[PDB]
Amino acid sequence: YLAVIKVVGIGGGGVNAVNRMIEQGLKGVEFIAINTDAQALLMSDADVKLDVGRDSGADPEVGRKAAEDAKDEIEELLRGADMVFVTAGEGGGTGTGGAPVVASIARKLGALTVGVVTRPFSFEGKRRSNQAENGIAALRESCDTLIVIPNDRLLQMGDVSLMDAFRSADEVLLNGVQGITDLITTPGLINVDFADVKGIMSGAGTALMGIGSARGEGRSLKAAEIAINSPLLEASMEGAQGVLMSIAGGSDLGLFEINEAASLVQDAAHPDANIIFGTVIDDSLGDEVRVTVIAAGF
Amino acid sequence: NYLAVIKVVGIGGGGVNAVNRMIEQGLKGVEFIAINTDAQALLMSDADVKLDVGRADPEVGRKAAEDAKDEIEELLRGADMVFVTAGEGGGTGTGGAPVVASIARKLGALTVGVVTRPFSFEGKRRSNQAENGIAALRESCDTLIVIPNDRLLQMAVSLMDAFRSADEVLLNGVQGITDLITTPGLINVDFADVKGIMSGAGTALMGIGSARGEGRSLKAAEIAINSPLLEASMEGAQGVLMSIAGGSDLGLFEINEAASLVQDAAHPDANIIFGTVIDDSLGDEVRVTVIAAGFD
Ligand SMILES: Nc1nc2c(ncn2[C@@H]2O[C@H](COP(=O)(O)OP(=O)(O)O)[C@@H](O)[C@H]2O)c(=O)[nH]1
């Protein structure tokens, strides 16, 4: 089965994240941008662009109505997918209100439905935080798995201006999608295919992600240690009952290194965790390896 | 007009999406027109010509199109052949399609509608609006190619496969014919003979077949003629179009075997248009499309 994967970015933040995914060369997926601004969509490099809410301000009820009014068109665009990602920055109107509609359509159609969203920075204000909380609750009900990335924890990583901060958010949304899709589209020595991913992500519920990267001697152990200690995982890894871990490297990434990383992750996980390890070939990476952990159930 | 001017109009979200699929797959030799009919949403398109007359209901799309009839006419003027489709799903496109078709035909273009019947498992929305859409489009077209998606389940299909299959055959509803006209092969056709079987023909059905290796042309042609999408309309059809696509190496003998088979299968009084299409990207595969129009 050659899986058909679609990645939907909805609202300003989601469409910007999708643009970043395109710029960084994420392959094997169809990119769909949904927003309420036709000029912003003209700039997007997505394969499919839908402008919603045309007759209808950070009001999630407006975003929900705009998506619901477009539900036949969204369903037309998603029909045939085996897997749909719905990506957004939570806390605004279009993404907050519309993402559960998109996800519900994908789930009704039986696609493995993965949400990947951010919680807003605390400095964006209490209304955005409250709106994101409600949007996440709604989205969680419409997704198989919902990966939630707390933007506040990004400020504990990396170097930083406001534009820089939101570029880092774009990048972590990319990392969350690509960490999963590259297992399917560009596997390495340890092949974790669509059926395996569906096995662990179907109905898994809320999830967190951690990412790490390293180079040179001991890179895989270091990358895995960084990933499982990631601030984005909220010190929660030991409580997860389901863990998907992908390690990406060049063609020469060897079984010994892979196994070193897997063993570290096993030792850190809950005694009863179901953990699936997969590898990715990415010949652009040079001497670097990148470990992505998705932790769910919990 | 010794290069037939063919315009392919996608109207509504499903029809625009279908046109976008055709562009992505590199359908050559035709002009693409994307007409958005919804006020509340716009599906963007890479088509050459775009018209947003919206400013989900068949009557809404009909009035949107009627209100823009002068602009649509100017887009279509000069065409020898116009395809019109609302693609998969319903909505406002189902109301707009017969307006565009009526304009094309009043202009003198050979007007070919393409319409899908949804899978039975999709259910049915009220007033028999889908079948009313087919009847309205039929009344406005020279030939209406009807694709019954239910028959795809006879060609073990998964739900995602079923939806992808429907999209692929809709694309073939256009490309099988336009390639025969626009892309050279060993056996080429006169557009006048295409017009001869499709003008005023009414409903048509399509069959598709593919095969590889020895005997591939006969094999693919047998599959196409027996396709469940033709609903055994083949024996009674009074007009038959058949195109064989394959590489430049397709041999005259195997081509002629496939042509002989379709003549044997067709009604004795059928008009039959036959030709081939050189598509060197197919490798050793051949792809046959049969269009059966009219009836006994
Ligand atoms: N990844 C990313 N997130 C953003 C960006 N701009 C804003 N955000 C986040 O996304 C949330 C929603 O804003 P936005 O997507 O513009 O609102 P919407 O268009 O109404 O859904 C904001 O509160 C920010 O946390 C961006 O450029 N990239």
Curated annotation (Swiss-Prot), chain A:
Domain of life according to the entry: Bacteria
Cellular component, GO, one term: cell division site
Keyword field: Cell cycle, Cell division, Cytoplasm, GTP-binding, Nucleotide-binding, Septation
Cell compartments where the protein resides: Cytoplasm
Binding residue positions for GTP: G12, G13, G14, V15, N16, G93, T94, G95, E124, R128, D170
GO biological-process terms attached to the record: division septum assembly; FtsZ-dependent cytokinesis; protein polymerization
Gene Ontology terms for molecular function: GTP binding; GTPase activity
Similarity comment text for this entry: Belongs to the FtsZ family.
Subunit structure: Homodimer. Polymerizes to form a dynamic ring structure in a strictly GTP-dependent manner. Interacts directly with several other division proteins.
Functional summary from the UniProt entry: Essential cell division protein that forms a contractile ring structure (Z ring) at the future cell division site. The regulation of the ring assembly controls the timing and the location of cell division. One of the functions of the FtsZ ring is to recruit other cell division proteins to the septum to produce a new cell wall between the dividing cells.
Name by which UniProt lists this protein: Cell division protein FtsZ
Organism: Mycobacterium tuberculosis (strain CDC 1551 / Oshkosh)
